[PDB]
Amino acid sequence: KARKQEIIKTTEQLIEAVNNGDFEAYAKICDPGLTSFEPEALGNLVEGMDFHRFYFENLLAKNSKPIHTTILNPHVHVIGEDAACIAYIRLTQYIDGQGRPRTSQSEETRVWHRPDGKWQNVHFHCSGAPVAPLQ
Amino acid sequence: KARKQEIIKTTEQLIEAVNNGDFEAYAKICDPGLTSFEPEALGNLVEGMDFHRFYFENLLAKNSKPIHTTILNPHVHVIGEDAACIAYIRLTQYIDGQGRPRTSQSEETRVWHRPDGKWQNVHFHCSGAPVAPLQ
Amino acid sequence: KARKQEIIKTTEQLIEAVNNGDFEAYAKICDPGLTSFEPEALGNLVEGMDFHRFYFENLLAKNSKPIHTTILNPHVHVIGEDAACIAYIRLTQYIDGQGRPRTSQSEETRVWHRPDGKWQNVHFHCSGAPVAPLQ
Amino acid sequence: KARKQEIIKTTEQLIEAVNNGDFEAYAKICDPGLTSFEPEALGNLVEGMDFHRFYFENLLAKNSKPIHTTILNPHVHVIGEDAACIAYIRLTQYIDGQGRPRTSQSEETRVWHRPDGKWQNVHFHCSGAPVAPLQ
Amino acid sequence: KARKQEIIKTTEQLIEAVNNGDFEAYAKICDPGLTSFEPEALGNLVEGMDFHRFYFENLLAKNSKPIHTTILNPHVHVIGEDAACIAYIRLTQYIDGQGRPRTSQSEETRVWHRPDGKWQNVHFHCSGAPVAPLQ
Amino acid sequence: KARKQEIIKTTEQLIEAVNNGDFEAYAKICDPGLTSFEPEALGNLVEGMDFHRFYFENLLAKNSKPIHTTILNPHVHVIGEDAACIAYIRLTQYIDGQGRPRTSQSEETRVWHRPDGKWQNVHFHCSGAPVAPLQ
Amino acid sequence: KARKQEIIKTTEQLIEAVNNGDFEAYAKICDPGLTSFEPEALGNLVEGMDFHRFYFENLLAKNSKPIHTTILNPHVHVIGEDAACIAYIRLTQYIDGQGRPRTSQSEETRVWHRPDGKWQNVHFHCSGAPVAPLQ
Amino acid sequence: KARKQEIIKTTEQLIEAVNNGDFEAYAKICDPGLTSFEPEALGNLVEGMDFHRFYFENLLAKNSKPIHTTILNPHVHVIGEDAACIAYIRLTQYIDGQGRPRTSQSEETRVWHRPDGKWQNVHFHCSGAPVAPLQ
Amino acid sequence: KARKQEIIKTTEQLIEAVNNGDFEAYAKICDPGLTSFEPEALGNLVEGMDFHRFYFENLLAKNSKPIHTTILNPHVHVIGEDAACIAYIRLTQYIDGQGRPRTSQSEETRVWHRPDGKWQNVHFHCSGAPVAPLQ
Amino acid sequence: KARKQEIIKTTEQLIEAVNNGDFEAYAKICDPGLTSFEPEALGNLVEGMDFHRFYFENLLAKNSKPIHTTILNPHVHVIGEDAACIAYIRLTQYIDGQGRPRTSQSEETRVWHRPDGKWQNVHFHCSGAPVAPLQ
Amino acid sequence: KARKQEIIKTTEQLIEAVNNGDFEAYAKICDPGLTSFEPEALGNLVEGMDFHRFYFENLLAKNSKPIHTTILNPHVHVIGEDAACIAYIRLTQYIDGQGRPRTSQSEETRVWHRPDGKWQNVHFHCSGAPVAPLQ
Amino acid sequence: KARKQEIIKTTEQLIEAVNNGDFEAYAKICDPGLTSFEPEALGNLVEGMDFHRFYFENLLAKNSKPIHTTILNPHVHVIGEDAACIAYIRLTQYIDGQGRPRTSQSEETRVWHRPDGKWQNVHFHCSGAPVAPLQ
């Protein structure tokens, strides 16, 4: 029951890092063997860090607008000493190009591995809208 | 090599059972704590086996019309000893109500746990089209 | 903590009783001075029991077609010692007129009162889709 | 009978404070454990104050264009000594972007609780249009 | 304040009489010099009692299906000692030709005069949907 | 019999003042406890004078386009000595925002009371087009 | 004056013949050099005016199933002292083919020559919607 | 003969005064007691020339383009020494804001009066185009 | 030189075989390890004979209507002694379900291998419209 | 053996040159008078490397912009000893002129031959899109 | 077979002349009676060479930069000993006024005659696809 | 001079024969080695009579609706002794789907050869609208 919290704490740290656009923190946690599905990939399974490395240098470079992100009803499933999974729903708020505020919803999955006592992410699934809000 | 093979073996068997409509085989493999994302849930994190039992007794009792399911390029990780993850793309061939062939795509994720003796599925995630064709 | 339980138990009983069309049972939980917003009222605050009595002779009596009701993540506030407020989301499954499955979502609110050693309902707010299934 | 009045007076104060785009007065009433269903939440249940704070910083107070708010036929229950619920309809008048008058209708619910000599809100349900009018 | 109750009681009696198709009861209260607006006149100010006699032999002779009538928030003015005005909303519940229920809304006005110790109706104005339900 | 004329004289002045855009005249004739049905109320029953003050300040006061109004075949009932009911039809000819002439129809009802020796309106009904000009 | 009533009575007599619905009576009233037109006649303007015959057939074919009639707000001009012009708006109520009651409207222009026992007409233009505006 | 000619001549004079906007002559030909059915009104019996005046003062101030008209199939009959009927189809020729060739059409009636030796029109029936078209 | 001929004959024979649905011949020429791009694959590389087997077993077998083909400007290379490539443009004629005439266009590439003295196709690449006829 | 790594070096070298304006690499690998399918010619079978020479030397050697190329699950067949066939899917990452990142999907094919030991590509086929993306 | 090639080169030089001052030589080589019809002519007889250059002028108006063109699968007949006709398809690669690469396709015909031992073009005909909407 | 006449006469005979769908006659005039361009070929150099044979069974066989064909501004070149060229304008009239005649224009160019003592067509280049009428 204690581990669940630190798993959720780690997930929050990861989401915060990607939002702030620090490639260093993302690289530290993400296992180079990471595999992910995103709408950015047009529905093709993608592997490796290089694919995401592009966005940290040209997309989030403009991440200056006011946004807010909420995490709803996280569910953590424990399957072993160094294995765990987490699922949750994600709500984000932002301001569109018309000056109005907008909201979007997306559900996500992540699988965590602990080699050498340190958690790392080895999978990622995003459904619905793209991670970056549409404006 | 060996373990990566049989994870695919079980996944193939599970996909076969759901297509055939056999409730017992699906019940055996699936873990009691199973969660799921899928379009049938309108974006909610459904849990348990009660929700899916509705479909088996009513809709999938018939598999008359032709259908062909294919799995392309599976990727499997092994976590620790008794945990693994599998990601793959699925192609479904079916005939529509107008009697013409039609193909649909969907990418899916799964997390497998083996407590002591039998592999079991604890989480699921289907993005895009539903688990069955739109006939 | 136990108080938060019997409320959810009662709410589950009331929803079950409505789905079975047994008006007699529904007349005990509900306080005579009931009020409610629901789509059937066209956005007007209805009061009393006579309004709902109509449905319990023609429509809900014929409520025999297969259906499944799910309650997701209820939340309860305990006010004072003899009152409470509960909110939740509701998922319904039904077979439409085309022989296909469907799902509908609607959130709800309820206020419970405890005079005379029993729990009773004194308000009800339903958004989104109608309470009854759309077969 | 007097207690049935100050609840209405308090509700009017809260609506005015929201309309003026002031946050300090808003916090002094709303309970820290507030929950609410609003269209801005896309049908989910949102807890806490942090979610609403975003709106008060970018949208409400920026223009304050001419508008009028009307409350019709409030209905109030008195539960115990420190609990009450209120239901009402709300008509709003505003000028659209085309320079023409418009109207919009919505119904709302609230639950009040008074620990330590102060009425405080713990639940809020809004159907139809959201709290903010569609200008 | 005493007069208001009897006026409302009279109005309810009148609505009951028309529903049951008793022309004699309708005539006993309504003043012979009655005018009325309603969709049945296509927007023409009708006058006299002959026009409405047509409905009490061919329209209500056919329709006998179950129906329920509700009256909401009646308001009454007193502008003398033998004259009064009443305004209210009305909701009707009826079953259409598909074997399913539906609701209709209309708002109405009436003017009452009291010659010979008896209240009499002199005007009527049904807005929105017509007086009768559309099955 | 002459009273049937002065009522029409007052009604004509009331409509003229409404069209012109001055608020003082409308206030004097209209009783403070005035009710009203009109499309701008979205089918609800409004009370008081403030609901219209918004219209006068923004739209009517700024009316600067040619339009025409006519009254066809009024009917007047005299009840008591200080009360009477008037019904009539209203054809409005207006130059639209496109600088083109167009016609629309609407029927109305008004109830008149004369305390202290001045006639005043206590109730108002309108159908079809809105009370305000359709420019 | 009195002669205004006489023409009114004769108009009812013409109506009486119309319910009988015999074309010979129609020919009797019409002057052999009468005029009439309508676009539904493709603008044809002849004494026969078969377009009148067209909706004479449709309307009067209903008479096997009972009908009722009504007229409103007649207006009369006496030409010199030897001819009379009469106009009005006519309401008719009928049972349709589906068994539902109906109402129909028809404006009318008629002119009658003084000579007693030989009254005849030179013109008529039903116009408006002689049969049905929009079904 | 001479009679029938001058009515037609007058008929044209009336038409020219319309297009030229010579209201004073139009007022001279038309009896102040004129009455008319025409689509400009929604089936009502307008009285006087004020309703038509709108189609002269504020319309012709900007509605002025080279325009022509053709009179088709006149047919007249005489009644007594001061009464007669004239019926005619009218074409109006001008190009609107579309490249398609254009020719509008109207068909009309007049009933004629000669008090004191000067002819005048007392009743007027129409259909199709208004007194003046859009430009 | 003749080698560039026989290859073209083989490709023409293959096209005829698939047109007539002779599964055996198609299997004989097609290598067991065939790859393929085509519109039906939604841009996914599909290997083996099972994927195409669906068309023969379901559609082509039942389909008995005729078909005709046009092949334009083939270019063939020569590599080694058991390899070759062919590129060309294609135009095809057939009959639909309604029987009305239908002609299709496609542009296709193929690669051939000749081990064991028998020419066999190991790769294929279509474009544009679907390979299968649209009946 | 070691063919998959062979294509890695060979295909990488070809792709790198393609993304650059140099023609030496393109000329050396390609085969003179070779057909190739690219949407640049609308399936006109661009013959000879000279077609690509014109654009690469003159225009396409523009200023580079941040772009990224990806290759997914390539498949290789080895024909005889001096030939091979390769298929794969190419995802292109680029930033459009609006300043927003974008991705595109396009599948390809290539046939390789070893003339006198050194490898040479004697065919090329691009589907879905051309070699280069559009900004 | 040689005579089939000389025609091609004569045409190849002639086509290249369009891009140089040799266009006058192209004019000189052709019969002064040279004539052609073009898709956009719709009755405008042209000298053949002029209209084709006019297309080239349009491209150079946008381009005014160096050009490359290609000719594919030429077809040449042999008629008599002093006549011949050629058919071919032409592609042009150019840089647009926006600086981006572009391509165009054309279909051409030419008639050749050799009096006095000099090949003279006596009839030309081009073909493109400039459909009117939006190019 | 006389040689010019027969060229036009034969072309008329071929065109008329084309209109009548008499494929056998068309097969005689046209040389077996016919080359042609046309919209149906999508800008491709078709060869042989097989492609054209299709139209003479489905489309040209049903050519029974009224049609009119005209020849304008014919011009003929005489090359050598057994060759000649013909160019002209073409106008076709036909009844469209709306039942209104339509006019279409199309320009051609042909080359005739005279072996065996008879004229035959060895080229054809149609532009603009298709050969067949667009009914």
Swiss-Prot record, chains A, B, C, D, E, F, G, H, I, J, K, L:
It comes from the Eukaryota. Disulfide bonds: none annotated. Induction: By cocaine in cardiomyocytes. It is found in: Sarcoplasmic reticulum membrane; Synapse; Cytoplasm, Cytoskeleton; Cytoplasm, Cytoskeleton, Microtubule organizing center, Centrosome. Belongs to the protein kinase superfamily. CAMK Ser/Thr protein kinase family. CaMK subfamily. CAMK2 is composed of 4 different chains: alpha (CAMK2A), beta (CAMK2B), gamma (CAMK2G), and delta (CAMK2D). The different isoforms assemble into homo- or heteromultimeric holoenzymes composed of 12 subunits with two hexameric rings stacked one on top of the other. Interacts with SYNGAP1, CAMK2N2 and MPDZ. Interacts with FOXO3. Interacts (when in a kinase inactive state not associated with calmodulin) with ARC; leading to target ARC to inactive synapses. Interacts with CAMK2N1; this interaction requires CAMK2B activation by Ca(2+). The CAMK2 protein kinases contain a unique C-terminal subunit association domain responsible for oligomerization. Calcium/calmodulin-dependent protein kinase that functions autonomously after Ca(2+)/calmodulin-binding and autophosphorylation, and is involved in dendritic spine and synapse formation, neuronal plasticity and regulation of sarcoplasmic reticulum Ca(2+) transport in skeletal muscle. In neurons, plays an essential structural role in the reorganization of the actin cytoskeleton during plasticity by binding and bundling actin filaments in a kinase-independent manner. This is Calcium/calmodulin-dependent protein kinase type II subunit beta. The lineage of its organism: Eukaryota, Metazoa, Chordata, Craniata, Vertebrata. The gene is Camk2b.
